[PDB]
Each structure stands twice: as structure tokens, then as C-alpha cells.
Amino acid sequence: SGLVPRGSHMSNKPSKPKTNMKHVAGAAAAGAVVGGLGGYMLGSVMSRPLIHFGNDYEDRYYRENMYRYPNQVYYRPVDQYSNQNNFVHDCVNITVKQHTVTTTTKGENFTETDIKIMERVVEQMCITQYQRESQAYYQRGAS
């Protein structure tokens, strides 16, 4: 018997870094205790409509209220339990704990209407997260 593990790093293949920022200063991130409990695979956005309210006030207030609250959802597949109804629960689970943290320094800044908006954006990330896995279940199994 013999153990023959794998690894892309074990090969020590020739790398090819293409970035000048590496040899250039600017900004840095501090906080060991922070990253120690981070490393989240939070999604991202660049193109396509996020909420697509359709109105001017909704899109205007939302754009300015983008910092008032998180618009993305935190990922955390590290869990044995699993359920459809509980699925979305995770989207708000991590979002809630992280949400209060942001308001731990202030406690209140957003307006009354901002809430109604924050509720929608949060419902889009939770609803869009579920459909995601669904695409895999549908393709592999077109019931």
C-alpha cells in the first residue's frame, strides 16, 4: 500500500503573474481577528439590473441607500442540515448577524422608506439564491 496524494502546488509549476500593483503600494487591510472569522464567498454584481424597481424614486433612493444596508447575501455551504424552506433562512441568517454589526457603531441612520427598500433587496438575494441550485436540479432532473 502507498499514499499518493495530489496537488497543483506540489508540482510547483511555472507561474505567470500579470499585475503591476504587486510592486506598487497604495492601500492595505488590517485586522487579524477579522479575517480569522471571514473568508466568505459573498456574491457580486456588475451588470444587469439588481432590483429593477422601474421607478425613478425607487432607483434613485436605492442607489443612494446602497451603503445604508447590504444588497448581497453571505454564502456558507458548511452545514450538514438541509431544507428548502430553511434554505433562504441562511441568506438572512448571516445577513442579520452581519447587519447588526454594521449598525453596532451607529444604531440608526437610514430613513423610514429605506427599510421598505432594504426588505426588497434582501428578498431578491434570498429568492435568487434558491433558484440557483434549482437550475442544477432541473437540468440533471427534468421532472
Cα–Cα distance for residue pair 143/59, rounded to 1 Å: 38
Residue 71's Cα: distance from chain center in Å?
8
| Distance separating alpha carbons of residues 89 and 91, to the nearest angstrom | 5
| Residue 23 forms part of a structural domain | no
Between CA 69 and CA 30 the distance in angstroms is: 23
Cell of 103: 449598525
Please indicate the experimental technique that yielded this structure: NMR
Task: Answer whether 72's CB lies under 8 Å from 42's CB.
Answer: yes
Residue numbers of the domain that contains 106: 40-143
Answer yes or no: is 34 within a domain. no
In a domain, 125, yes or no: yes
17 domain residue, yes or no: no
62, 121 Cβ separation under 8 angstroms: yes
d(CA 68, CA 108): 10
Q: Is residue 32 in a domain?
A: no
- As for how many domains the chain has, the answer is 1
Residue 91: which of 68, 62, 70, 106 has the closest Cα? 70
24 lies in some domain: no
Domain assignment present for residue 123? The answer is yes
In a domain, 13, yes or no: no
